[PDB]
Amino acid sequence: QQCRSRFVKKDGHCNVQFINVGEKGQRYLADIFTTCVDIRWRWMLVIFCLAFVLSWLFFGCVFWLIALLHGDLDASKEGKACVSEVNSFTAAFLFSIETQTTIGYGFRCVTDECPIAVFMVVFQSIVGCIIDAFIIGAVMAKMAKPKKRNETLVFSHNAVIAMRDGKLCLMWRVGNLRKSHLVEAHVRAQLLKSRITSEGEYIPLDQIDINVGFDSGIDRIFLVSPITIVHEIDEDSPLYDLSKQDIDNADFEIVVILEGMVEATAMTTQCRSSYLANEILWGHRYEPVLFEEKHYYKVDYSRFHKTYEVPNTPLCSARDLAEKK
Amino acid sequence: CRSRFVKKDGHCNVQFINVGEKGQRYLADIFTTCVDIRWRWMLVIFCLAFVLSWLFFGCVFWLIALLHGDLDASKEGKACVSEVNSFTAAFLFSIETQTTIGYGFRCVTDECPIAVFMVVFQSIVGCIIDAFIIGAVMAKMAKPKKRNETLVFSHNAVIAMRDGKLCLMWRVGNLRKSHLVEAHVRAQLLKSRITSEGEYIPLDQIDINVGFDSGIDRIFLVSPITIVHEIDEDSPLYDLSKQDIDNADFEIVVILEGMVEATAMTTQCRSSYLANEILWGHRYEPVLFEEKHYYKVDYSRFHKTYEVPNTPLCSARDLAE
Amino acid sequence: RSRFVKKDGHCNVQFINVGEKGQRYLADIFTTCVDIRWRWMLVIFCLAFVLSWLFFGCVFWLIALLHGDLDASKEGKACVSEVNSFTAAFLFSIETQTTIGYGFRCVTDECPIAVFMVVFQSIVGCIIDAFIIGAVMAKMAKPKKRNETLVFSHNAVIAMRDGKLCLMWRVGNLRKSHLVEAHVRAQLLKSRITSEGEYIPLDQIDINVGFDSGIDRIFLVSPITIVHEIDEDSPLYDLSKQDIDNADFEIVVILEGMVEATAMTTQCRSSYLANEILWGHRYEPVLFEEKHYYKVDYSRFHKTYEVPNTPLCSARDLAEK
Amino acid sequence: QCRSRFVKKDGHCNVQFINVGEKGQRYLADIFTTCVDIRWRWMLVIFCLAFVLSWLFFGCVFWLIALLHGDLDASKEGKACVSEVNSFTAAFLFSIETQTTIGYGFRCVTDECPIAVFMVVFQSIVGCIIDAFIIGAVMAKMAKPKKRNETLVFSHNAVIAMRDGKLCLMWRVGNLRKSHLVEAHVRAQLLKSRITSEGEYIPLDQIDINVGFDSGIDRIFLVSPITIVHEIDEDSPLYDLSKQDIDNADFEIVVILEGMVEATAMTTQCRSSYLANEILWGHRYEPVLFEEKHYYKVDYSRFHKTYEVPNTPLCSARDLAEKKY
Ligand SMILES: [K+]
Ligand SMILES: [Sr+2]
Ligand SMILES: [Sr+2]
């Protein structure tokens, strides 16, 4: 048994990667989009709250400092000056809130007594506008543009290698839950092996192909109802020599690919799966999915992941039939 | 009289009965929720949500104001949020503050630390739901949905003589000037078969070689062109009689795939011909509008054909025998 | 003979009657915003929004005069502290829609309908602002549809190479950006009559440049020539030099390509007309070596010279016969 | 030794194109290109200066209309359209209030100035217009991903190997991050300068390397770094090369691995080559994807290294072809 070396659909990559050079640095150099991917709904709101609240507290503190520096402290008696109608540090609170949130309560109005105040408040306003633009841009970017949803495609696990049209074939079918059929639906079949070269060397992992009809052009299936993609057996095929004990006591991963174009959005969907050692039940044909009605046709998934029996099949190897000249 | 898997265009029968796995959120409350609520009721839902936000905030301010300074009225009363004597005062205060309106008729005074705390929280709330609503209304101008406008198939298809053999033919019609990039084309035959071992297979799909290996499938489409399918030994329509053609045992589905300019939408088109639109003989009337500098076409006669005087009926391998 | 059907070389096509299925339902916003393209839409929308301002000003003025004709001043104040009905209401609407809190007038508790009405106008104003800002964002962010940076050549360069006849065409890229998944095609347009004796005004034939062999996906950083070897499968296998000059066959080339950092599939069309032909010509070695540096220069791109010696109509005859 | 790729992507290292200006002039006529060229180095200052110059222009025009008509013409009587301002700073601050929609109640306008209301409604309109322009400009960079990533990478060291009774030009490709690719092409192109049959010096030209385009083994499903075979044959143009021929001569093997990043719309691809000596005769590759006892973990520490094969034939392809018979 192996039960690894595949994408995380069944089992998985099993503790991905190992200690190496890494080179996955400068995360915050371009974290504009990665953070929006990672932050998630859990604490984005509090991130914005804390960032922008500290943003106006810094400026409120500097207004408080300049108010202490100039104006009232020079002469508290009479002294027509700035910080009118407000006092202390609550003055800084209210001024910062009114100016940042563009609220016009009008209790405090700066004047010619503080010529630096106009420059200070205009710089504050432009910085606040920039920060608001950043916030709204981030919220827009996370909400609408990405679409992480691809589960409407499903690969039936149970599969069969058996008789068909006078020859042998191993088959697999796909299903969908809703409408909006795919466009340019490819299909592939790859087999995981371990080999030793003729010169002599241990190759740990090897990829070999299964001819599902790439050169015949029968791969672009128009999928509205489940269909069983098959593979005829021949001497060119790498599986012409397999027995029951051979298939049962040896492990090979038939990884499958159904990369497809979902409707509308330009997200290239792609699904992966494999059958490890025993999911292929020899001599177990498939059942009809017919749900015919007098008026038109529909179907439900009340018979998936099962099989009908066949008692009369050549219980032998693929080349055994070729032996019978 | 069969299933007719062809989708909405032309004949239409596609659906599913039982429900699998659906949920984890309204439907997305992310983007499909905005998709389904197009035009109707989305403005109503969000505007009622926002006005209920004002109602909640103003109710809280009214409660805190009546708790704080309403008890000692008619005796000085230098409490916070002055100029309040009823619910309407605090309600309109919330209206101004959340709409960042600076009327100034309202007041906040000092020594009311809870008031400023709630003011900053409600300001943040107003800002964040303003961002949410602007992002939501943005999505209306995000996905352009179209299934027409320089892409359509033909209501008429026919099998007829042509140089070499009989051929199934079909054209694709257009509306405007715009062209198509990577124009695929495919034909599939749906029928029923029985395995030699013996078992009922009502559903079987076979391919029609329109020249996938020969490379004649990417058509530069500016005027309608009749894609044709030759007849050979590999084809399943090698020799069938008139009873076969007027019988209903096969269905021809035709599929086109393209990408309109200045967009990333993989447009797909599907059409059907069961047993009746295909006719024996006949020929398409040419679009013969070759004139001076005035270059024109007209699809007024697009869906029509005429009849050949005399044509062979069977032929096939008659020369060898 | 002159019914050209391309776009970038010369000529075009037009449509008449065509059933008129391309009728706008005004349900499309992106196309409407694209069509104007910064010409007059800013003016259209600013006048739309200021007429909304005037509508609101008029309705506030009407309600004010409704209350104004009742109290007639010299009473317990009013809902709005103003005397000039039109100007005060207009400025009130302006400042409220712009969130300006000048506060020269008041609100009072005598007009709850005024509170309801200002709530509705604030909602309408925020929705309209969101709509306009979203439209501007959608139009500006979506690119201008450049569709350039790839250029074709002038005339067919039918000549000899490696002892065989061949047509060649080069491609220029003035910028530095490269292409991904660059296809290449070549279609010949002509007129044909079938063996049965019927007229086909327009017929397309393919000119393979490497399909089914893999040599069509060029990695384009230096201007490279694409050539078509002459074989039996080629249509113009052997024919006189005078007739091809008299002939009006049209060669159209397609260089579908993907430009970096986008999702738009570019495509280019060219014009090679048979009325002018340069038989037996060869281009210039654009590649120049600069010791430590390498370069090419497009000053001689649209130029070719003549080989002093070249076989004429070197067919199977006189080479095997 | 002319070429187009030295060791790595963007390895042109030459002069920019000259004598062409047909469609490379109107750089500023576009907005997206201007946003792409500019970065956060100076954008803050650009927006700041634009919007503050709008401020100054509006303040100046309000001050000019105040001089034209108002209270300063006849200082007596309170009949004026501003209850304040008789100074540049006050008018500027009023312009700031109007632009940033603060809402200070310190000043207002009188009904006898229809110009004033016309001016301020145009003021609000243009304020909204430039606010929308700024927010869209700042949005453009945040949402659309423009940074280039290098999750996939080639191998520095490549070898020519005597494997499976034939000869190959072995090379493998590594993936840094865990993410996978969709529709993974692979190509190999030889750059050379030749002379035609009649005797003309052909400039730089490209020839193809048959990695299995027709056999269909090019769409590799990449979760473990896998080598690429070539299976040198008589049809290949590398047959006549000998042991010293590769060293004395030179040739550029450009490799492209066009791929699709997960859940996006970018057709990423990478370019690399080997000049004349990076290819080592014989040699093999260590099991970089070494099996770990529990499950699969892979270390790339030994990625760019090779193991010296004890004994392999050292001759040309024609030599082995003739030695066979
Ligand atoms: K092929
Ligand atoms: Sr605002
Ligand atoms: Sr694409």
Nearest to A258 by CA among A187, A180, A152: A187
The answer to whether D103 contacts chain B (CB < 8 Å) is yes
Q: Residues C44, C49, C51, CA angle at the centre, nearest 5°? A: 95
| Ligand 2: centre distance to CA C174 (Å) | 45
Q: Do C109 and B96 touch (CB under 8 A)?
A: no
Q: Give me the sheet containing D158-163, strands edge to edge.
A: D227-228, D166-172, D158-163, D279-281
SS3 state of residue A118: helix
C159-306 homologous superfamily = G protein-activated inward rectifier potassium channel 1 (2.60.40.1400)
The answer to whether B310 contacts chain A (CB < 8 Å) is no
Q: Give me the sheet containing C179-180, strands edge to edge.
A: C179-180, C257-259, C265-266
| Ligand 2: centre distance to CA D254 (Å) | 54
DSSP B88-130: HHHHHHHHHHHTT----SS---SS-HHHHHHHHHHHHHHHHHH
- Residue D135 identity (one-letter amino acid): I
Q: Which class does domain D32-143 fall in? A: mainly alpha
Which ligand neighbours the alpha carbon of D213 most closely? Answer: 1
Strand partners, B252: B189, B273
For this PDB entry, the determination method is: cryo-EM
What CATH number labels C30-141?
1.10.287.70
Residues of B in contact with D267 (CB under 8 A): none
Residues of B in contact with D101 (CB under 8 A): 100
Element (H, E) at B303: none
Cα C228 to chain center, whole Å? 30
Using an 8 Å Cβ cutoff, are A214 and D216 in contact?
A: yes
Of C12, C101, C135, the CB nearest to B141: C135
Spatial distance between the Cα atoms of D177 and A13, rounded to a whole number of angstroms: 13
| Ligand 2: centre distance to CA D116 (Å) | 23
Minimum CA–CA partner of B186 in chain A? A220
Q: A153-323 has which fold?
A: Immunoglobulin-like (2.60.40)
- In chain B, the N- to C-terminal Cα span, in Å, equals 38
Residues of B in contact with A301 (CB under 8 A): 18, 20
Minimum CA–CA partner of C86 in chain D? D111
What CATH number labels A31-143?
1.10.287.70
Minimum CA–CA partner of A217 in chain B? B212
- Residue B248 identity (one-letter amino acid): A
- Residue B244 identity (one-letter amino acid): D
What tokens appear for C56 in the block? Answer: 């609101």
The answer to whether B229 contacts chain A (CB < 8 Å) is no
Q: Do D300 and A20 touch (CB under 8 A)?
A: yes
Please, which residues have CB within 8 angstroms of residue A176's CB and are 6 or more apart in sequence? A152, A153, A154, A223
Of B116, B131, B134, the CB nearest to A93: B116
**Cα C287 to Cα C149, C295, C300, D4, D204, distances in angstroms:** 20, 6, 11, 11, 7
The answer to whether B307 contacts chain A (CB < 8 Å) is no
Of D51, D147, D180, the CB nearest to A126: D51
Residues of D in contact with A215 (CB under 8 A): 214, 216
Which ligand neighbours the alpha carbon of B215 most closely? Answer: 1
Q: For chain D, state the CA radius of gyration.
A: 35
| Ligand 2: centre distance to CA D46 (Å) | 21
Of C180, C287, C293, the CB nearest to D15: C293
Chain breaks in chain D (C to N over 2.5 A) after: none
What CATH number labels D152-324?
2.60.40.1400
Distance in Å, alpha carbon of C141 to nearest chain A alpha carbon: 13
SS3 state of residue D65: helix
| Ligand 1: centre distance to CA D241 (Å) | 29
Interface chains of chain C (3 or more CB pairs under 8 Å):
A, B, D
**Cα B295 to Cα B94, B288, B292, C11, D232, distances in angstroms:** 67, 11, 7, 9, 55
B213 is in an annotated binding site: yes
Spatial distance between the Cα atoms of C9 and A113, rounded to a whole number of angstroms: 71
Spatial distance between the Cα atoms of C132 and B70, rounded to a whole number of angstroms: 44
DSSP A58-111: HHHHHHHHHHHHSSGGG--SS---SSTT--TTHHHHHHHHHHHTT----S----
Minimum CA–CA partner of A152 in chain B? B21
Spatial distance between the Cα atoms of B289 and B304, rounded to a whole number of angstroms: 17
Question: What are the two backbone dihedrals, phi and then psi, of residue D140, each rounded to the nearest 5 degrees?
Answer: -55, -45
**Crossing angle between the packed helical segments A31-69 and B113-138, to the nearest 10 degrees:** 150
| Ligand 1: centre distance to CA A180 (Å) | 31
Nearest to B180 by CA among B272, B268, B254, B294: B268
Residues D12-42: b if buried by 16+ CB within 10 A, e if exposed: beeeebeebeeeeeeeeeebbeebeeeeeee
Residue matched to tokens 């040699």? D283
Spatial distance between the Cα atoms of C297 and C300, rounded to a whole number of angstroms: 7
Q: Do B219 and C204 touch (CB under 8 A)?
A: yes
Half-sphere exposure of D129 (CA within 13 A, CB side): 16
Residue matched to tokens 């002294």? A79
The answer to whether D102 contacts chain B (CB < 8 Å) is yes
Question: What are the two backbone dihedrals, phi and then psi, of residue D131, each rounded to the nearest 5 degrees?
Answer: -60, -45
Q: HEC states along chain C?
A: CCCCCCCCCCCCCEECCHHHCCCCCCCCCHHHHHHHCCCCHHHHHHHHHHHHHHHHHHHHHHHHHHHHHHHCCCCCCCCCCCCCHHHHHHHHHHHHHCCCCCCCCCCCCCCHHHHHHHHHHHHHHHHHHHHHHHHHHHHHHCCCCCCCCCECCCCCCCEEECCEEEEEECCECCCCCCEECCCCEEEEEEEEECCCCCEEEEEEEECCCCCCCCCCCCCCCCCCCEEEECCCCCCCCCCCHHHHHHCCCEEEEECCEEECCCCCEECCECCEECCCCCCCEECCCCEEEECCEEEECHHHCCCCEECCCCCCCCCCCCCCC
Interface test with C, best of D144, D208, D270 (most C CBs within 10 A): D208
Which DSSP symbol is given to A310? Answer: -
Minimum CA–CA partner of A103 in chain C? C101
Residues A93-112: b if buried by 16+ CB within 10 A, e if exposed: bbbbbbbbbbbbbbbbbbbe
Domain boundaries, chain D: 32-143, 152-324
Query: Which of these CATH numbers, 1.10.540.10, 3.60.40.10, 3.40.30.10, 1.10.287.70, describes B32-141?
Result: 1.10.287.70
Residues of D in contact with A122 (CB under 8 A): 52, 55, 96
Which ligand neighbours the alpha carbon of D182 most closely? Answer: 3
Using an 8 Å Cβ cutoff, are D261 and D222 in contact?
A: no
Domain B152-306 part of CATH 3.40.50.1820: no
Half-sphere exposure of D156 (CA within 13 A, CB side): 6
| Ligand 2: centre distance to CA D126 (Å) | 14
Residues of D in contact with B264 (CB under 8 A): 265
| Ligand 2: centre distance to CA C319 (Å) | 83
Using an 8 Å Cβ cutoff, are A285 and A160 in contact?
A: yes
* Alpha helices (H) in chain A, listed in sequence order: 31-69, 90-100, 115-143, 244-249, 318-323
Distance in Å, alpha carbon of B111 to nearest chain A alpha carbon: 8
Using an 8 Å Cβ cutoff, are B95 and B105 in contact?
A: no
Using an 8 Å Cβ cutoff, are C230 and C237 in contact?
A: yes
Distance in Å, alpha carbon of C187 to nearest chain D alpha carbon: 24
Using an 8 Å Cβ cutoff, are C58 and C86 in contact?
A: no
Residue matched to tokens 């005397």? C83
Cα C23 to chain center, whole Å? 21
